[model samples]
Target: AAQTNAPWGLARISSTSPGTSTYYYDESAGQGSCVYVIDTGIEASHPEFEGRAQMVKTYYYSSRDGNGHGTHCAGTVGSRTYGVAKKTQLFGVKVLDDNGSGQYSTIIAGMDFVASDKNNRNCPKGVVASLSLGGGYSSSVNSAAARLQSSGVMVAVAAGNNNADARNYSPASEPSVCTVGASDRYDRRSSFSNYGSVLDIFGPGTDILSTWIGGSTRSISGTSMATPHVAGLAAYLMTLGKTTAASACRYIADTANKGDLSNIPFGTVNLLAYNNYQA
Candidate 1:
């Protein structure tokens, strides 16, 4: 059965602000779940994580952020303020280099690490890899994501920052991964977000505030930022017994704000917008 311990006032409020006890998505959510961020590493010392985020391993550079991309995404995925699953353990898989760029082979290596149980600890139900990186289509990336999904790991990939069809990208085009696009606060598609039939759902991406390097907070926009929101939600779902990647992805699309983007093709809805908390 799904976990039913949702936090108080989570459905009625969407802010962490004080006085009203108005809650955002439950801060106690995502018990026993983990998220692997495959990007430019993270600042493990960031105070926003309060020691919750871990730097398990790295592929290129040391498990410390220099470009700040991974840390920002990690905060959105699992932090006290900007997270969807506040309790989910975060692992930094540094696939990209300091320049925020990497080869497909490097990204595949990161996925390989996540699929290996020896490297991913404390996650009995497997982990969700949040990929904020993308490039042109690559069969190797597609293969890696499919294999990881087969191994019970869920993958949430950005639909690319390019304002074009996402099917032309690698992991975003992979059939097994949840391809996430960007949406604004108004539930509208972001101006720079890629769209098409391949995109699974939309997440808050514009001017989204999250933790940055050096224990700081900043606001940025991109499909990269959007992917973690979906990834964090998927991690929370996994904590409940929605362990299968397919089931979790299906739940996101099915429960999203459907038909919110009727003007676009298959631009169905926004993720993390619904307040249907289980009692």
Candidate 2:
């Protein structure tokens, strides 16, 4: 019954703040910006996300939400009031359907949907692309990610949740892409996050809860959760100095609390420190 005493207080707490902790900080810093979230559709009508979350253009290659995994991931990145960057825009691409499974070709089409050939407002320039899913490795995805990089668009993909091998997933395995792995709030690696010599960096991703359907919340873990933290930080940096996603990411990796992961061991990486460089 002790835990139930603070029922209403739950809403004030956020996973980003670490268990009911409170802090006074700026929230409007990332206003007027947007990011493309390539995953299952977001419940735009939910109370917390109502009218805030938008669908730029959707590709329903698979329109299922079997376990609500995609929704949970979406919430962590930029769902609505629950996201790291609440005011930022989110472009949904249903590449993985509801069952949490997707094809390589569909993933590519989704990337193109946001690149130079963006079908709608999906992957327009200056908006970061957030990919939370992955396959082993693919030259096609790598090439497409490089295209985004060439155009100054930031492509942030999850390093995958597999722990057995240090090899990163596709899109993430792509060098030009900002491949993100998981680290606890303390800057330690998550038990399930994949790592490798080529891994780019790590971000907060343990027991993360974000927006979901019906104004509810769900807890999730993975490189997927970690990837959005980087994306949100990049968006914040974009507002301070540069508008291009590349410069935003460069600022973070080169300068947050930590961004450089040059020496983290495979599968047990740590968050890189980059709190010094300015733009």
Candidate 3:
């Protein structure tokens, strides 16, 4: 049941034969798991979502995701056609505006919301969150992300697209959450991806194709794109009983494909995120 023409990003991660373009996946791995997409927003009604994507709340813009960034990240995390974990639930929490810029206070508000939901008895028990956006260092955002992870929600954040050391970034600098960098299909660190001691793993991000607003699709590259792949894998792990943030982090680090990438910076790890797939 492999998709012969699956997107390179998906195919590259699940191949039994790398010479051929095929995606071999574990179909039942992501059920009963949910990932909160804290980004610009998401157009949940897109056909790719198949009704699994939900807009939990919006902190800016209209209720819909106008920027398309959030929807793209969501698709990478759980789209039926382009995702890492197909059965995982997606909850969109808009924190950035259409322009992809926001203040620390606005971003922290979204993290606070996700943390608050942990207290709800009816909330999804296996919680994960993907933050595919960040800026310069900010203690407010770092503290918020730390509190969110402490609340038992597995957090995966982008290392950043700065093409420099990620230590200067906020959420990415926070060692408590999983900091992810971008890698290309050639198994090399993305030219524009940030690298640093804080980074935990790499994921395919260069020229990633995923859902956008208006039920469309687009290909873009960034550490922003890479983070969702990690989040999706985290959700997949949660379904396998690695539900806590610490367990999710350990699984990601321990199961990652080691030394698969090249041109990694001095302090960055060579680990690439892996979701158990047929060899």
Candidate 4:
């Protein structure tokens, strides 16, 4: 079946019949206006993002595109054409080096960089911080996420790829954080998507085709792809509510088609129901 979850890449309508986009223009409505894309750097130049996307800040743990994991993740979440939050401002944090390995401290440092009150002097007062990475669960990173939340920033963490086990990563396992789970293109939980009562909401994460590292497009699996869908949708909802991760998440759950989910252990994500609520 055709996946309705794929992000709509074009703002303009194409000539031929039918549509190949994941999203449709709804004019500017919903919650969250600012989003902090905590991933690798972006492509810098893409036609789909001609007038969209900007590099507000960057923290390169590596000298250049070494592993391309961050770049791939960045493009997935904040890429111009294939991204979920293409219109939202992005802050790239190079936590993992080219080797795709980084200590918890590196990830903490990235969050700390955005969580700091110092950056407020330049960018928007309240920003939504998104991390598409997760491992188990940690008190320290959870504490940091709480700090960011207290400072009025929304922190989004990817649940995990352990396929239903909650005993994973530090930040994704935290309750205060918006732990996002992934759903297949058909809206079913992928065999690889981790799920638990602690996980917040589900987004289009399976078989997601997005911008790659070398100015090309490819499809990658895992919850990593789902994080941005919610991130982008959060921006849409932000237009309707206060700027915070909680508010944005509330808006997403309130606006997404939750009815699409019914097979999950805790119950399915009402993607359409949430969408109507936001409407």
Best TM-score among the predictions, by candidate number: 3
lDDT of 3 by residue, 98-143 (tens): 8877788988999999988656523343888999989999988899
lDDT of 4 by residue, 89-186 (tens): 55556666565666677677778877773355343324676787766567887777777666766766777788865546767777776777777655
- At residue 183, what lDDT does model 2 achieve? 62
- Regions of candidate 2 where Cα sits further than 4 Å from its true position: 1-20, 23-25, 61-67, 117-125, 164-168, 259-263, 266-269, 272-279
TM-score, ranked from best to worst: 3, 1, 4, 2
Which candidate number has the best lDDT?
3
List the candidate 3 regions with Cα displacement exceeding 4 Å: 15-20, 121-125
Q: Candidate 1 regions off by >4 Å? A: 1-23, 117-120, 266-275
* Model 3 score (lDDT): 0.85
lDDT of 2 by residue, 113-167 (tens): 7775333443333477778888877888777777766665678888888863435
Q: Which candidate, 1 or 2, has the higher TM-score?
A: 1
lDDT of model 4, residue 157: 72
Better of 3 and 4 by TM-score: 3
Per-residue alpha-carbon lDDT of candidate 1 for residues 150-248, written as tens digits (9 for 90 to 100): 777788899888888888898888877888888665556778888877788777676777888888988888999888887888887777665456567
- Model 3 residue 27 distance off true place after TM-score fit, in angstroms: 1.5
Quick one: how many clashes does candidate 3 have? Answer: 0
lDDT of 3 at 45: 96
